């Protein structure tokens, strides 16, 4: 599903401030990462990235194609292709703690300035 910025922002409240990243920054990252499509799938360099967060099966989730990755998040990659974001967010938190925000290549070039536009004023 292609979510709206506000739908995403509301869904990820509990990640706000984690490792120093704000919701404004996350709304920006997620838009340029997946276009807010919970079903996004991009396969490259021998790996596939899943969902809103584009979590890779190279290390983070388990897939059929690459069944023995570290599956650091302890979740099947297909749980990253639905509209229930709790587990996606939990996995992203693990990435943030382990790798950090630069796992998301959109952050530095597209979200280092003009953050105010990413706020969702909708309660």
């Amino acid at each position: 599903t292609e979510l709206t910025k506000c739908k995403v922002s509301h869904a990820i409240k509990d990640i706000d401030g984690y490792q120093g990243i704000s919701l404004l920054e996350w709304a920006c990252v997620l838009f340029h990462t997946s276009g807010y499509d919970t079903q996004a799938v991009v396969n490259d360099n021998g790996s596939t990235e899943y969902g809103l967060f584009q979590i890779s099966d190279r290390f983070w989730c388990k897939s059929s194609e690459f069944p023995e990755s570290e599956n650091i998040c302890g979740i099947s990659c297909d749980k990253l292709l639905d509209d229930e974001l709790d587990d996606d967010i939990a996995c992203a938190k693990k990435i943030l703690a382990i790798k950090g925000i630069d796992y998301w290549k959109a952050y530095k070039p597209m979200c280092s300035e003009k953050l105010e536009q990413w706020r969702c004023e909708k309660p």
């Binding site: 709206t4 920006c28 838009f31 340029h32 991009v42 490259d44 360099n45 290549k105 959109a106 530095k108 070039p109 597209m110 003009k114 536009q117």
Partner: protein
């Protein structure tokens, strides 16, 4: 004999845009008798200072092209522009290179007429209000400001993809567009960066006037997201000097002049 008014008196404002009924170019040509070979049109009523080459990057989307032509030709004539339609067809199987094809369009169009304005448009975007003029302004113009795909909203202020317009000078000023972005994403952001580095700002009609419809379609296995796009856009300041109009090379495999448009099939090489 006299200059066209600042605003055309033929405008209707909002329009219904639907992609349900099948299109027939022969009918399209019948409805648009004033359009000449190659998709050229010039107001016989007044003199337009807008000499516009409309450039469409293209590969295997003849059906989208049909709708584009069906909707835009009447709109563009109402806008009283002296325009030409150029479909830049990428031959081959390498990943799609939108910006390189736009660069090609710029050079080839200039061979036809002394255009002073260039509108770059994806083939799947249609404007819903003819007040959103397909021409150039004092500053680079972003036209597809409120696409239905983005909820009839501008997704981010730095967005310059979809449909845009640059005068010849503005385009020459940024050394045109990059040639090194293969695959989907980021090239429009690189162009945005170029305009900013050259002291320009992006002009846009408001969100109501700039409503646009996008003909959705299945993912293109020939235009997979470009893995290097995020690295590439961080270096525009340096690469715009060495990658652009001044480094453009390609081979024209065929030039077809149809009644509603000019289609140039080109060999633009492979990812280097």
């Amino acid at each position: 004999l006299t200059a066209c008014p600042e605003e055309s008196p033929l405008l209707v404002g909002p329009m219904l845009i639907e992609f349900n009924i099948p299109v027939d170019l022969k009918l399209v040509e019948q409805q648009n008798p004033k359009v000449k070979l190659g998709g050229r049109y010039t107001p016989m009523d007044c003199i337009s200072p807008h000499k516009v080459a409309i450039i469409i990057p293209f590969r295997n989307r003849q059906e989208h092209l049909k709708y584009w032509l069906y909707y835009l030709h009447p709109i563009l004539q109402r806008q009283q522009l002296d325009y030409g339609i150029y479909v830049i067809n990428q031959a081959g199987e390498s990943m799609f290179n939108r910006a390189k094809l736009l660069n090609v369009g710029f050079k080839e169009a200039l061979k036809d007429y002394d255009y002073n304005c260039f509108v770059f448009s994806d083939v799947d975007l249609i404007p819903m209000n003819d007040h959103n003029t397909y021409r150039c302004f004092s500053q680079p113009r972003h036209i597809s400001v409120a696409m239905d795909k983005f909820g009839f909203s501008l997704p981010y202020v730095q967005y310059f993809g979809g449909v845009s317009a640059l005068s010849k000078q503005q385009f020459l000023s940024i050394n045109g567009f990059p040639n090194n972005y293969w695959g989907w994403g980021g090239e429009d952001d690189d162009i945005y960066n170029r305009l900013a580095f050259r002291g320009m700002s992006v002009s846009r009609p408001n969100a109501v006037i700039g409503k646009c419809r996008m003909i959705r379609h299945s993912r293109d296995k020939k235009n997979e997201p470009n893995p290097q796009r995020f690295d590439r856009i961080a270096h525009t300041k340096e690469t715009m000097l060495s990658d652009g109009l001044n480094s453009l090379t390609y081979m024209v495999l065929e030039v077809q002049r149809y009644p509603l448009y000019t289609k140039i099939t080109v060999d633009i090489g492979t990812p280097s």
